[PDB]
Design a protein around this ligand. Structure first.
Ligand code: HEM
Length: 383
């Protein structure tokens, strides 16, 4: 995969975490931008990004070791639609409905273990554990084996140790999969075993591997959102916290704004499949495209005062952090839900938060698939 850093040439981790300067420059000076080093055409404007992602005919997701029945992301029509549906049966609204109380409890539990005398590391205490545990419980891992699950997860999805983890994971999970085919429950594994689209169904092996792709998709990213939300409430605009506390009805909207403004730096790759000029330039088959959804989320043509955090900007929900078109994130309702709940619960308990002057950002960022991610975020909370 094309690495962010090669295109960006950022001196600091902090700048990759808060790239507002660069995004403005690219949006205004070089919106459709060839990068020789990576031989990559780089797309920044909302309208263009939106249209590249929607126009799969011309911008294919087929890449330039995984049973293609479960290769959803790296597939075009007509295959993609069927591969998506087999999974989507495990993420119905009903299931989100059902999952809320379970997710509620997991959150309460974790907020419980935070007091507010000592400094809290939100990352270790909430950002990382919540989605992992939620997946664990939502899939069908029993409560006691959670720590073992985290262990395989951290190893596999937080950047030979993995070889081991995979196998333990696989042989831990395969039995359970086999068990649940026989004795269904209300969970993802069970949902996925009953999934049938145009006759096709999942093999047990495919269900197991599907759970790995799910975790692959939805732990790093949700966790990044969470850590980042908190970073924002500490550093970006300190009034927001107090605003949210007094009116919890606003937390969803604030989540969209963290998705818009604070999920840096996310991109996607496509490959040109049929020659075209949709970006006002002729691209040819095999040309690689990279769309910078973080930048598009800061395009003034779409969002007013885009370089300011504003949770009341009425169109924040139109951000492209979850992509756009056929591949639009299947787990967005879940990620949104987890964050709503995680944030509400914490707001409901603590009244104020505060930064810690020792803590330096540079020292607590590492490379992730979505540009710099927080290793720890220490704060102090009251109540
Ligand atoms: C903040 C959290 C998340 C973000 C920012 C995020 C972002 C994205 C993005 C940008 C894509 C599009 C990839 C592409 O167009 O090639 C995507 C696809 C996907 N996401 Fe997520 N995602 C998140 C959470 C989740 C979760 C929690 C799950 C599952 C539990 C999930 C499952 C998927 C799947 C299955 C796809 C493939 C969709 C397809 O190709 O049909 N995501 N996500």
């Amino acid at each position: 995969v094309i690495a962010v850093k090669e295109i960006t040439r950022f001196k600091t981790r902090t700048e990759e975490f808060s790239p507002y300067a660069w995004c403005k420059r690219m949006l205004e000076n070089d919106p459709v931008s060839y990068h020789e080093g990576t031989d990559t055409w780089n797309v920044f404007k909302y309208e263009d990004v939106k249209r590249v992602l929607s126009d799969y005919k011309h911008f294919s997701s087929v890449r330039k070791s995984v049973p293609e029945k479960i290769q959803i992301t790296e597939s075009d029509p007509p295959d993609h639609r069927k591969r998506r549906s087999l999974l989507a049966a495990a993420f119905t609204p009903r299931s989100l409905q059902n999952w809320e109380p379970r997710i509620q409890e997991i959150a309460d539990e974790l907020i419980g273990q935070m007091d507010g005398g000592t400094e809290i590391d939100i990352v270790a205490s909430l950002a990382s554990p919540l989605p992992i545990i939620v997946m664990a419980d939502l899939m069908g891992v029993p409560s006691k084996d959670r720590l073992l699950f985290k262990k395989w997860v951290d190893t596999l999805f937080l950047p030979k140790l993995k070889q081991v983890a995979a196998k333990e994971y696989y042989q831990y999970l395969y039995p359970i999969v086999v068990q649940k085919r026989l004795n269904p429950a209300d969970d993802i594994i069970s949902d996925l075993l009953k999934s049938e689209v145009d006759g096709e169904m999942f093999t047990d092996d495919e269900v197991v591997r599907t759970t790995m792709l799910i975790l692959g998709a939805g732990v790093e990213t949700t966790s990044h959102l969470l850590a980042n939300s908190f970073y924002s409430l500490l550093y970006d605009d300190k009034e927001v916290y107090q605003e949210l506390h007094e009116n919890l009805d606003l937390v969803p909207q604030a989540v969209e704004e963290m998705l818009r403004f604070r999920f840096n730096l996310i991109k996607l790759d496509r490959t040109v499949k049929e020659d075209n000029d949709l970006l006002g330039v002729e691209l040819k088959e095999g040309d690689s495209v990279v769309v910078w959804m973080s930048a598009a989320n800061m395009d003034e043509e779409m969002f007013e005062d885009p370089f300011t955090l504003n949770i009341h900007r009425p169109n924040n929900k139109k951000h492209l952090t979850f992509g756009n078109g056929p591949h639009f994130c299947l787990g967005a309702p879940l990620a949104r839900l987890e964050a709503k709940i995680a944030l509400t619960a914490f707001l409901k308990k603590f009244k104020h938060i505060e930064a810690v002057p020792s803590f330096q950002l540079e020292e607590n960022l590492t490379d992730s698939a979505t540009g710099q991610t927080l290793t720890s975020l220490p704060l102090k909370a009251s109540r």
